[PDB]
Structure 1
């Protein structure tokens, strides 16, 4: 779900939510997808 663009707010902190709004939840930024897709783009071209 990190690669599919979903953030689990219970994974990176102690929760003290269930509504998808950035004043309480957090925007996820797909900076790890581009690193993995070079290596799956080279395995095919090998």
Structure 2
């Protein structure tokens, strides 16, 4: 779900929400995808 742009807030903290708003939820920034796409893009070119 991190590769598909879903941040689970129960996974990076304790929760004391469910609705899709950055005042109380958190925005996910896809920075892991580019490093994985090198390597599945290099296996295509071997």
Distance 1:24 1:37 in 2: 31
Give the 3-state SS of the residue equivalent to 1:34 in structure 2.
Answer: helix
Q: For residue 37 of structure 1, report the CA deviation from its aligned partner.
A: 0.1
The runs of 5 or more residues in structure 1 that have no matched partner are none
The runs of 5 or more residues in structure 2 that have no matched partner are none
Output the TM-score relative to the length of structure 2. Answer: 0.98
Aligned residues: 46
Give the 3-state SS of the residue equivalent to 2:41 in structure 1.
Answer: helix
Distance 1:19 1:44 in 2: 39
Q: After the TM superposition, list the runs of 4 or more consecutive aligned residues in structure 1 that deviate by more than 2 angstroms.
A: none
